[PDB]
Write a protein that binds this ligand. Structure first.
Ligand SMILES: N#Cc1ccc(Oc2ccccn2)cc1
Length: 284
């Protein structure tokens, strides 16, 4: 059923809350035993958001291999994403270790450091060229190379150095800066442009490790980003673009990380983004 017609049917009936709860009811439930170990309590921002054991990212160290991050592997679409929480003061070094070990080219950030007058994640990147950051626990160095500030997002070029081997890599930071404190954007126009800006970069492409995507918990806005990307790519390689079932794609992604899409407004916004993004893909 063409999703644009399904959309108008849900909107006219005002059943967004009822659709959303059906997804919550059918979603996968797998063990998260490593996340709940007492040694890992200060590695978790929220007590109710944990990565499943089967899909969690492991740090390459014998001490403690735990980070709040999950590998989402989509098969027909042939895309991988790592979805993680906003780093904590004690997990900034773990975060950059993961970016290094997984060979990621891009980091996507969908939140501000402060929202609603509270801290949503640590200041984990350098703000000035001449004041670089060193993470002593993971032996990494991070330098701001350049910054391009636009109206809806900022792109930063960073240099990450493995102080152990003296190899360096260029990491692109894509920072979406205008998601509102409450609700969802009124139009998906600025959100879709941003995805194409990550796309254009090569950060989503198979010659690199998976893109690292985060918000505060790494399920809400982060969920919206990878659901829209995957839906639009399937609409491209399939004879009938109308086959694409946004809900069934979202249940496949919830097999890898719990809670993706946190509200009925985020679910509606995901529909709008895919519907709009498809008009300039089906050849416009
Ligand atoms: N990559 C990918 C992917 C494609 C399809 C998926 O689920 C369905 C199932 C039946 C009809 C439509 N979509 C889930 C993931």
């Amino acid at each position: 059923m063409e999703m644009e017609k399904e959309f108008e049917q849900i909107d006219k009936s005002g059943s967004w809350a009822a659709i959303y709860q059906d997804i919550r009811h059918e979603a996968s439930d797998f063990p998260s035993r490593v996340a709940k170990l007492p040694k890992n309590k200060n590695r978790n921002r929220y007590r109710d958001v944990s990565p499943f054991d089967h899909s969690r990212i492991k740090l390459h160290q014998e001490d403690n291999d735990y980070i709040n991050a999950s590998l989402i592997k989509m098969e027909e679409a042939q895309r991988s994403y790592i979805l993680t929480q906003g780093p904590l003061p004690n997990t900034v070094g773990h975060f950059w270790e993961m970016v290094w070990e997984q060979k990621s080219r891009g980091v996507v950030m969908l939140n501000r450091v402060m929202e609603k007058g509270s801290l949503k994640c640590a200041q984990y990147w350098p703000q000035k060229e001449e004041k670089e950051m060193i993470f002593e626990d993971t032996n990494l160095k991070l330098t701001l190379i350049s910054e391009d500030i636009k109206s809806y997002y900022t792109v930063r070029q960073l240099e990450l150095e493995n102080l152990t081997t003296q190899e360096t890599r260029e990491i692109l930071h894509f920072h979406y800066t205008t998601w509102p404190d409450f609700g969802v954007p009124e139009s998906p126009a600025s959100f879709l442009n941003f995805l194409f800006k990550v796309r254009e970069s090569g950060s989503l492409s198979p010659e690199h490790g998976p893109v690292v995507v985060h918000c505060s918990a790494g399920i809400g806005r982060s969920g919206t980003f990878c659901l829209a990307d995957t839906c639009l790519l399937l609409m491209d390689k399939r004879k009938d673009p109308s086959s694409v079932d946004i809900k069934k794609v979202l249940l496949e992604m919830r097999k890898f990380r719990m809670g993706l899409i946190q509200t009925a407004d985020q679910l509606r916004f995901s529909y709008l983004a895919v519907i709009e993004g498809a008009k300039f893909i089906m050849g416009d």
